[PDB]
Design a protein around this nucleic acid. Structure first.
Lengths: 70, 78, 101, 64, 106, 92, 125, 52
RNA sequence: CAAGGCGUGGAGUAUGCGGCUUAAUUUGACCAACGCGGGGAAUGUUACCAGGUCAGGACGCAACUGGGAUUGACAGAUUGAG
RNA sequence: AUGCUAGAGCCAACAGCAGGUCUGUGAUGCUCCCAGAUGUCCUGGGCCGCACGCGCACUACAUUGUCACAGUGAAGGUGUCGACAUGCCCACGUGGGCCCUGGCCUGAAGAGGCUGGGAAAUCCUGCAAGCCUGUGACGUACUGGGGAUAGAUGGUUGCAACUGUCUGCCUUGAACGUGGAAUGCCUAGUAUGCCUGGGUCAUCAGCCCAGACCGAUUGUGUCCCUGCCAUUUGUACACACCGC
RNA sequence: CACCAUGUUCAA
């Protein structure tokens, strides 16, 4: 429908190579797939995800505090 | 985390017969006519109030007084 | 009679006005159609360093400035005539440059 | 703590120029190791008689 | 072009400052009080002002020719581009530097 | 110090031609008027100054070395130079 | 295996100028830049190790500091010991590692499992 | 062995003070290349004056 | 301080400090420390950690030693590393 | 033109503090290391690592507002190896480029090509700054407020971007509904808001140092709080009330 | 005229 490809949600989709607009829970299904792919191999980012940390290089010293006073 | 310290307004989103005919009949006889006054007096959306102000001013039942981004003052024609 | 631009610049307004007055006096000694000292806006070089050599105390700041004064002189003169009136010795600190077109 | 690495020291091979030239009273001096061909003067320099290479050092060049 | 006016004058200042610092290390036992720099056509003249010119100049201008050469070769001056000169400081008592180094050596 | 003979000879030729020598403190460069590394110039002038053939000054980031009488005598002996030739400092 | 809809056959029988277009932006730029001598050397060494251990086993572990280096199909299947700064973590390079660097599979810090806060963790101490 | 001082880049490890040779806090504003600590000793000789 | 204005303390981040974890998370400083060391560190910066080089150990003395003190290096291994 | 020292700053005495800095210096005494180095260089890592406490700043909690289009419309300044380059790249034994960039062209953007200017009151640049103003959409709803987090992937800087440098595009859409005890700054072009330049910088500004722009509410006092100066007075204090 | 307790040893 003439929507360009740079407008799309999955713009190259490793495992497929196709361009598609992930919509209505295939969004988080594809997010889970991309985290599974990165945690199967021991990629640092997948490790951060599985440990429940702040990927893409933030400072986890004083910001993601999340309650839990000690 | 420790926290240290208004029932909802259900405003008609689209018109209806009673509220529309009331807009036609009663409102053009108000001293000050504004988006807020229309919305409170008819329990109607603010965007419907802007639409109503525009339509009534267009077809002559209301005259502008001071229309602007802030309060859009209209008044009864005569 | 050729168009000449004598540009003078200095960090010393006294030593700059002395030499500009000297050159105007020389260019009128045998009147050379001088157009007087065009005063280009003074360039303030502002350098604002921190006083302390270590990061202790109220953070204070030394605000140094260097003012650069620039004055133009325009002449219609021959080459060696203007170079004469220029070569009469110039005060220290004043940078003089001559242009001809 | 792991062991220490030795500093490389030359073998101190004595009188190499002797084993370089085999002298013949019948004929005359024969040179056991080939000389190295270069526009830079290597006519007096010798290549190493390696098992699988001939290696000139003043130039750094190797045959196989 | 080759240098701004801002950068040309700040560089003139840095050049004078290096000259002064070198010269006050080099002529401290001799009454060095100051230095003037006069950029003239045919010669960038440098006038050293010291208490004892007799020993700011060496055995037959030896030391001042040393300094001239070494300034040429440090600041990359076109040959015949700089000339160093000495001149007795007129007062020797109005110079805080020349008296500071005197008290230093006492 | 292990300086090549041609580097030694070039540095000594320069130091004797001009009775003075300048060397930037930066050792990883080569300084102009020589094909010799600034490091080699400095490591040679340390030796000359400790033997007393050179007076050393260091102002900001540069070394300035001045030949002495003992230094001109030694450089004569080393470079095999006739008494006809004296440094440019002595030329006048 | 289907990386971007291209199995190992196509991925290995490809061009580095086409790896440029199949890989992501950062690997593509790193290749546009003409990847360097140490990277080419490591690729050559990996070819060596794969020809060394061919059929009945896995290739030997080739040790590198090159966390800088992108993973590419020519690297699939090899055992690379990537440096942390203390140890050479062996990494069996799978297919779902392509594009990523070796520093993403060798980790440089031990995950933080905290202890007692101790004195000076608050203002009551 | 000609990897001795062969770090390939250029930056705050090559920018050293023209007096101190120290790379911390240099003032390269007008090609000055001083360090903020030596500039406060040298300034008056450069021609900078403290007006306001 | 009074009259007041904008707030800060509550939220999410940026950053410094303490603590904990770590091979190391270098370190100073506790009104007048804490976006301060002009300290916004990818790398050189860097001082910390795992390794590996080089001497850039002058000068003097003694020993060795041109029937060679020492230097540099191809290739195969080795190395993270031509 | 004006009348708190005209405003604002600069400089600022005498005595000190065992305040900070030996990690600014070819400032430095004693002392330690000194070749298997605490020298130096190179590769990698770390300084950023996260059950938590705090300082501080930025963004908000919206309609005196957000978005969309458009208009009007600053000031201080910086800018092309004079340390680097004694290099790297294109071009052709040699020229040009490296900083700020105009105008044209390609692209949805980010950005990239072609071609010019400026060592600068000359070119960027009258920097067509943002707030602001006009209109339209929204309509009191954690909402078209907020934009944290996270996913696929296109540039750029750099030798090198992983622990994402910055940045484009779509998507994801957290807390926060004005904040307890407590507490900071402030008296007129000031507070606040709003952006801009410079420093750092090959790239990174939520920082600092300045710049304008819009522009006030109150007060013109007091010694209540917290402290300062002076005189009188008491004292068993003098390390001086954090005393004895 | 609410209430306002305390400050390890030597060193200066």
């Amino acid at each position: 429908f003439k929507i360009p490809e740079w407008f799309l949600n999955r713009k190259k989709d490793p495992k497929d190579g196709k361009f598609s607009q992930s919509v209505s829970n295939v969004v988080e299904q594809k997010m889970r797939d991309d985290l599974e792919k990165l945690k199967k191999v021991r990629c640092h980012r997948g490790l951060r995800h599985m440990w429940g940390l702040r990927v893409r290089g933030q400072h986890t010293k004083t910001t993601g505090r999340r309650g839990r006073t000690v | 985390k420790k926290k240290w310290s208004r029932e909802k307004l259900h405003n008609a989103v689209m018109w209806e017969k009673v509220i529309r005919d009331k807009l036609y009949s009663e409102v053009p006889k108000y001293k000050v006519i504004t988006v807020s006054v229309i919305s409170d007096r008819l329990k109607v959306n603010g965007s419907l109030a802007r639409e109503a102000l525009k339509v009534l001013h267009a077809e002559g039942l209301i005259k502008p007084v001071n229309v602007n981004a802030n309060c859009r003052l209209y008044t009864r024609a005569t | 009679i050729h168009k000449i631009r004598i540009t003078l610049s200095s960090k010393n307004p006294k030593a700059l006005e002395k030499v500009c007055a000297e050159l105007i006096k020389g260019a009128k000694d045998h009147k050379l159609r001088v157009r007087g000292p065009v005063k280009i806006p003074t360039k303030v070089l502002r350098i604002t360093t921190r006083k302390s050599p270590c990061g202790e105390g109220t953070n204070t700041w030394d605000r140094y400035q260097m003012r650069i004064h620039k004055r133009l002189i325009d002449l219609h003169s021959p080459s060696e005539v203007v170079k004469e009136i220029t070569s009469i010795n110039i005060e220290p600190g004043v940078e003089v440059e001559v242009t001809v077109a | 703590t792991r062991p220490k690495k030795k500093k490389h020291k030359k073998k101190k091979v004595p009188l190499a120029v002797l084993k370089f030239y085999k002298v013949d009273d019948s004929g005359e001096i024969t040179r056991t190791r080939m000389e190295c061909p270069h526009p830079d003067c290597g006519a007096g320099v010798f290549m190493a008689a390696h098992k699988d290479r001939q290696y000139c050092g003043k130039c750094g060049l190797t045959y196989v | 072009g080759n240098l701004s006016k801002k950068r040309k004058f700040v560089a003139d200042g840095v050049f004078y400052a290096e000259l002064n610092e070198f010269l006050k290390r080099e002529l401290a036992e001799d009454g060095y009080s100051g230095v003037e720099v006069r950029v003239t056509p045919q010669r960038t003249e440098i006038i050293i002002r010291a208490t004892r010119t007799k020993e700011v100049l060496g055995e037959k201008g030896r030391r001042i020719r040393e300094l001239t050469s070494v300034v040429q070769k440090r600041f990359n001056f076109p040959d015949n581009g700089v000339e160093l000169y000495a001149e007795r400081v007129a007062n020797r008592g109005l110079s805080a530097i020349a008296q500071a180094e005197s008290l230093r050596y006492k | 110090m292990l300086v090549s003979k041609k580097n030694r000879e070039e540095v000594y030729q320069y130091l004797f031609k001009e009775g003075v020598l300048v060397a930037k403190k930066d050792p990883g460069s080569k300084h102009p008027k020589m094909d010799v590394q600034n490091l080699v110039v400095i490591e040679l002038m340390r030796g000359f100054a400790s033997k007393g053939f050179v007076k050393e000054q260091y102002a900001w980031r540069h070394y300035y070395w001045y030949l002495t009488n003992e230094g001109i005598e030694y450089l004569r002996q080393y470079l095999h130079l006739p008494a006809e030739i004296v440094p440019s400092t002595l030329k006048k | 295996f289907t990386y971007r809809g291209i199995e190992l056959e196509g991925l290995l029988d490809l061009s580095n100028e086409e790896l440029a277009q199949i890989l992501p932006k950062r690997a593509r730029r790193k290749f546009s830049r003409g990847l360097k001598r140490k990277h080419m050397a490591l690729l050559k060494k990996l070819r060596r190790a794969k020809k060394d251990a061919a059929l009945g086993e896995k290739p030997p572990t080739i040790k590198t500091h090159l966390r800088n280096m992108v993973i590419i199909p020519e690297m699939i299947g090899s055992m690379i010991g990537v440096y942390n700064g203390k140890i050479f973590n062996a990494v069996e390079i799978k297919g779902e590692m392509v594009g990523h660097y070796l520093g993403e599979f060798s980790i440089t810090y031990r995950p933080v499992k905290h202890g007692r806060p101790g004195i000076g963790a608050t203002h009551s101490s | 062995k000609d990897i001795w001082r062969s770090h390939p880049g250029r930056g705050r490890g090559t920018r050293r003070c023209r007096i101190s040779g120290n790379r911390h806090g240099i003032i390269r504003k007008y090609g000055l290349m001083m360090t903020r600590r030596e500039f406060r000793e040298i300034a008056g000789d450069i021609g900078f004056v403290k007006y306001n």
